[PDB]
Amino acid sequence: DIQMTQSPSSLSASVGDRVTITCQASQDISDYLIWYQQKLGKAPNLLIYDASTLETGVPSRFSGSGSGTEYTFTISSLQPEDIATYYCQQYDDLPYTFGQGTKVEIK
Amino acid sequence: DIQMTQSPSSLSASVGDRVTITCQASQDISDYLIWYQQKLGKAPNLLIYDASTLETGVPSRFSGSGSGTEYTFTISSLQPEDIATYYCQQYDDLPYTFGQGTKVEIK
Amino acid sequence: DIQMTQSPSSLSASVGDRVTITCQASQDISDYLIWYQQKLGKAPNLLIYDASTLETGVPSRFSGSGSGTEYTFTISSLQPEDIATYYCQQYDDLPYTFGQGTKVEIK
Amino acid sequence: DIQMTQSPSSLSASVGDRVTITCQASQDISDYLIWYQQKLGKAPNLLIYDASTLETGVPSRFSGSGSGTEYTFTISSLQPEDIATYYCQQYDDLPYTFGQGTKVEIK
Amino acid sequence: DIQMTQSPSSLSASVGDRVTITCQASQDISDYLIWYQQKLGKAPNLLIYDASTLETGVPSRFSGSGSGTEYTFTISSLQPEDIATYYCQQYDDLPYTFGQGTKVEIK
Amino acid sequence: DIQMTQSPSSLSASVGDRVTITCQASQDISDYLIWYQQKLGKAPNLLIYDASTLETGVPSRFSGSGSGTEYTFTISSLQPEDIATYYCQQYDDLPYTFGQGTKVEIK
Amino acid sequence: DIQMTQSPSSLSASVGDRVTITCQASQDISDYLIWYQQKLGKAPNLLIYDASTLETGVPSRFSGSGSGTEYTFTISSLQPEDIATYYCQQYDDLPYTFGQGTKVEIK
Amino acid sequence: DIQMTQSPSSLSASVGDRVTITCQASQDISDYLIWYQQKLGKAPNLLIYDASTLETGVPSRFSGSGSGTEYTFTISSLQPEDIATYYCQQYDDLPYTFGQGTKVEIK
Amino acid sequence: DIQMTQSPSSLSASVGDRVTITCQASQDISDYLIWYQQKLGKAPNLLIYDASTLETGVPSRFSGSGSGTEYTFTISSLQPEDIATYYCQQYDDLPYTFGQGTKVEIK
Amino acid sequence: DIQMTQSPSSLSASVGDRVTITCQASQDISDYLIWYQQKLGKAPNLLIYDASTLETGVPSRFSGSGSGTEYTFTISSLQPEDIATYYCQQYDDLPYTFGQGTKVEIK
Amino acid sequence: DIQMTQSPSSLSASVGDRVTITCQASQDISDYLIWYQQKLGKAPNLLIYDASTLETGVPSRFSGSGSGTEYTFTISSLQPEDIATYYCQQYDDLPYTFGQGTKVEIK
Amino acid sequence: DIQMTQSPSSLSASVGDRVTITCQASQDISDYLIWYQQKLGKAPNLLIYDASTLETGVPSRFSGSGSGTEYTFTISSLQPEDIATYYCQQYDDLPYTFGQGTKVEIK
Secondary structure: OOOEEEEOOEEEEOOOOOEEEEEEEOOOOOOOEEEEEOOOOOOOEEEEEOOOEEOOOOOOOEEEEEEOOEEEEEEOOOOHHHOEEEEEEEOOOOOOEEOOOEEEEEO | OOOEEEEOOEEEEOOOOOEEEEEEEOOOOOOOOEEEEEOOOOOOEEEEEOOOEEOOOOOOOEEEEOOOOEEEEEEOOOOHHHOOEEEEEEOOOOOOEEOOOEEEEEO | OOOEEEEOOEEEEOOOOOEEEEEEEOOOOOOOEEEEEEOOOOOOEEEEEOOOEEOOOOOOOEEEEEEOOEEEEEEOOOOHHHOEEEEEEEOOOOOOOEOOOEEEEEO | OOOOEEEOOEEOOOOOOEEEEEEEOOOOOOOOOEEEEOOEOEOOEEEEEOOOEEOOOOOOOEEEEEEOOEEEEEEEOOOHHHOEEEEEEOOOOOOOOEOOOEEEOOO | OOOOEEEOOEEEEOOOOOEEEEEEOOOOOOOOEEEEEEOOOOOOOEEEEOOOEEOOOOOOOEEEEEOOOEEEEEEOOOOHHHOOEEEEEEOOOOOOOEOOOEEEEEO | OOOEEEEOOEEEOOOOOOEEEEEEEOOOOOOOEEEEEEOOOOOOEEEEEOOOEEOOOOOOOEEEEEEOOEEEEEEOOOOHHHOEEEEEEEOOOOOOOEOOOOEEEOO | OOOEEEEOOEEEEOOOOOEEEEEEEOOOOOOOOEEEEEOOOOOOEEEEEOOOEEOOOOOOOEEEEOOOOEEEEEEOOOOHHHOOEEEEEEOOOOOOEEOOOEEEEEO | OOOEEEEOOEEEEOOOOOEEEEEEEOOOOOOOEEEEEOOOOOOOEEEEEOOOEEOOOOOOOEEEEEEOOEEEEEEOOOOHHHOEEEEEEEOOOOOOEEOOOEEEEEO | OOOEEEEOOEEEEOOOOOEEEEEEEOOOOOOOEEEEEEOOOOOOEEEEEOOOEEOOOOOOOEEEEEEOOEEEEEEOOOOHHHOEEEEEEEOOOOOOOEOOOEEEEEO | OOOOEEEOOEEOOOOOOEEEEEEEOOOOOOOOOEEEEOOEOEOOEEEEEOOOEEOOOOOOOEEEEEEOOEEEEEEEOOOHHHOEEEEEEOOOOOOOOEOOOEEEOOO | OOOOEEEOOEEEEOOOOOEEEEEEOOOOOOOOEEEEEEOOOOOOOEEEEOOOEEOOOOOOOEEEEEOOOEEEEEEOOOOHHHOOEEEEEEOOOOOOOEOOOEEEEEO | OOOEEEEOOEEEOOOOOOEEEEEEEOOOOOOOEEEEEEOOOOOOEEEEEOOOEEOOOOOOOEEEEEEOOEEEEEEOOOOHHHOEEEEEEEOOOOOOOEOOOOEEEOO
């Protein structure tokens, strides 16, 4: 029910470039936000849990800032292995809803 | 982080062929299992929760059952629109963990 | 001289979506940042100068802000017309260095 | 403001003799003219500034000057590596208007 | 014999634009050079002769420049009917060599 | 000016026959008539100067004759390479005039 | 059966444009050459015989000359009524043989 | 002078149909009659020479009977390649006069 | 049965011209041949019967003659009225077979 | 002689029921009546003779008879392929007069 | 209910001609059939009723034929005023069905 | 006969209003009045039988009422499909009579 609006739809960046991606909660998801990396044909992996906390084993190069209905994802220094798809998912209340997803390509 | 296990990884069934995919967990993820349908290059969407609870709008043909450490998803008659990859995910304990996923191809 | 890095290269998004871009200067380029939008076949066209100020003729949708080294350009609501390439160019010292450019697209 | 007018919009040669390009200013502009080349794809790389002074690393094949209002740019020997689109930019004051541009060819 | 090398071969300019064709002769010559305007399906017509002297009638915007081995043909204001191909012929020594040609199209 | 009359406009025949073109002059220009080969979009090219004298390189197939004010052109045997527009120009007085041309072509 | 050879196959001349068509024979067809004028869908009619002898009623503008193995037909001023196909034919020796023919079009 | 009257003006016939065409000599042409086939845009070819004799290489299917002022042409068995125009020509005395011509079409 | 072939189909001729038609019978139809002229919208109208005999009401211009298998119908002088279609019909055995018909026209 | 009178001259139907056509004789004619159909374009093809006996290959849909003086022809079911014009011919004796005819339609 | 199928829809006959319309009823009926003559811009007038019984006054040439399910309307002599459209109505059972119609035009 | 009076002759109104037509009878025909729909050249069609009773298929917009010798017709709301001539026929006695009709039409 809660609409998640994520931008941009597609991306590119030279190695080591400051990337940012956003999701827009149609309602206040109270920071209940998780970030996922979906490699080319694999299950989604959890990066952040509740707006800004990273999962253990996840580099500090990946980060998230946010509040209210605006959270953001950053890959300070892009990397080849970073090529994937990042989705956000409000887990504030079921139906748990993913944002559209951001393809992330290296030029 | 409860490990999940899906199977199989791909299945070519035929128009109207009953499919049964299974996700096995590593703890009593209780009733906190959710089944997603993800179409080519689109965001995983929620079809069912509480191991078997359809979300309001889903075709009846999707049914889910099983409890505790094992769960099964079912599509009685497999229609065109269903060619998607189906993943499960446990919303019982962070990090909300998915299953390996299954690629449902048509025959 | 003064090296400009612009992020990202290309970026397809949809209408109304916020679009944010950045570009960093090799050294302090204290407020002297021009943003250029360039449509194919046409030539660079001013929109903002001094990093924040908009050339009197640009929508209030296009905006620029940034603190002394890291500047960001923002399109609050993509409208099909915005299909172009934007270049950030520093003019604190000659040669005036533009950044790599960001091709914004529809999808 | 200051309107620039370059000529032509397309301009060719079989390597050697002259490649001249017109760029007429809308009012006196000291000699704060500049010349960029956009090797189609990348961003503009400037060759001359202050009307006639080449930058560092730029071939003796490229030149131009004039004053007041009229400036011609010459490629005094078309080399193949010189495929590009050249622009002129008055930088007397803001906005920094642009010359329509010229697509230089080889034929 | 004498070898005339014209440039460019084709160029795009607009109404009001200043085009410039250039023609170099293999040897010195004083002024035995002619400029012709061959219209699409017609025989060459004489514009300027002896370099800068222009025949009776030819519009004021037509000019030839030169005093030895380097000459220029200028169309001050490029107009809809000025579309043709231009030529440089040396009537100094026989055979009467022509420069290559500059087909002039509008925009 | 000296009015020139060339004929015909067009001429189409087989790769082996005769192509005889004529040119009359408003003034017996003595013997100051030239013969050109105008291949599809290449500058004119001298073939015969002063009614009959062939220039070096010219194949005997092409001959010219004519006294005072009436001259004819003649390719004894048409070769496929002879596809062009053929022009007569008088180099007796000024301005140098031409005849409409003759797009000689095979069938 | 004396082979005959006409040329050219078609010619666009202008109102008042002198036309010269030639028929070459393979033996001394002597003076036994005849020139016909054939209008669209009408019977070839006789304008001249004995290589050059006008038939009583023909416009003076038709003249024929040449002798032995070569013959030419002429129309000094080409008028409207003349758009026809002109063939020659030898009445020297059976089978009375024509020439390839020429299509005289107007310009 | 001698009028040749040929009938019909136009014809048609299924493959293999007995065709006859006539010419009427206004004077007794003493069998000096030739038949010609004029294919769609080609020179006239001689079929018969002197009322009834065929030219060598001409099928026997084509024939001619006649005397005095009445000769006839027959194509016993019409054929596609027979599509043409047949004219008769008295060659008894100049002016050699052709009959009007018979278009011959296949239905 | 008894097959009738009529030649030719259509035939445009001019006034006073002889017009001759034929039609052959598959086997001996010893003298029993009717000729029919049919004007558009009207119906077949007798003119001759028995091959030679004319129905008392027909011009002496229309005639028929023929030896046992091959019959010919002749119109000595076409007059505009004769625009019709003629059919030859055998009546030596039922079914009485007409021939294909000959549409005679003006031109 | 014997005058036939058919009715109507035009006669239609929407396929199925009856199509009757009158043809009244001028005197007794045994039963030597005949019925032809001229599919517009081609010649008449007979269907019945001796008043009521069909020919070989003619559909059972076509019939007719009567005697003495009156004969009606019926199409007992209008088929589309039956567009035509039907005639009747008395063949008692000569001339073989015709019935005015009837243009059968479908509407 | 009962379904009357008339035929033909239109016919052309001449003065003195015998027209015949036919009308079939869906079921048996004894004679409850009427024939009407609707004149161009008028209400239907009753001609024959109960099939063959004709109303007082109607001209003698009018007749109806029938005794069960097949009926015919005959106009012995088609006259100038007989031009109308005819109809068949069954007053056996309600609703009172009509046959289609036969518009009768003269010639 | 029973004289019928219908009114009016013509009636023109808008697609939505009322069309009320009347019919009086020379004899109170009791209730044996019928109502027809006469669409441009199609057989009549029953609408109401015995003053008021609608036949199956008939839309209620059309109603009828009337005792003995005076009946009215009524389309409550005129629809564009109702374009026709409307007739009254009495089926009480013989011969069955009608009223002039009523070409009801829009504007």
